[PDB]
Amino acid sequence: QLLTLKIKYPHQLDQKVLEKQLPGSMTIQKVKGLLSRLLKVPVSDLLLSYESPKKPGREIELENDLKSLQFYSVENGDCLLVRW
C-alpha cells in the first residue's frame, strides 16, 4: 500500500534524483500537486509515466489524473519519470 518510488527527470539527468514514499491510493493529480510544489512548475504542465525494473526502458503512461497509482499497477520500487 505504501509505495517507495524513485524519481527521475529524464530531460535533466539519467540518474534517479530522489526517493519518495507515496500511498498506493494516491491519485496522479495529487502526485502532480506534490511535485509541483517541489519543482515550482504547474500541475497542468507535468507529464508522468513510470518504469518497472522487470521491463527496463519501457515507459507506462499515467494520463488520467483522477486515477490512483495502484490502479495503474505502480509497485514498490518502481521509477517515476517526471517531465515538464
Swiss-Prot record:
Signal peptide: none annotated. The modification Phosphoserine is found at S52. It is found in: Cytoplasm; Cytoplasm, Cytoskeleton. The modification N6-acetyllysine is found at K20. It comes from the Eukaryota. Tubulin-folding protein; involved in the second step of the tubulin folding pathway and in the regulation of tubulin heterodimer dissociation. Required for correct organization of microtubule cytoskeleton and mitotic splindle, and maintenance of the neuronal microtubule network. Supercomplex made of cofactors A to E. Cofactors A and D function by capturing and stabilizing tubulin in a quasi-native conformation. Cofactor E binds to the cofactor D-tubulin complex; interaction with cofactor C then causes the release of tubulin polypeptides that are committed to the native state. Cofactors B and E can form a heterodimer which binds to alpha-tubulin and enhances their ability to dissociate tubulin heterodimers. Interacts with TBCD. It is linked to Hypoparathyroidism-retardation-dysmorphism syndrome: An autosomal recessive multisystem disorder characterized by hypoparathyroidism, intrauterine and postnatal growth retardation, psychomotor retardation, epilepsy, microcephaly, and facial dysmorphism. Belongs to the TBCE family. This is Tubulin-specific chaperone E. It comes from Homo sapiens.
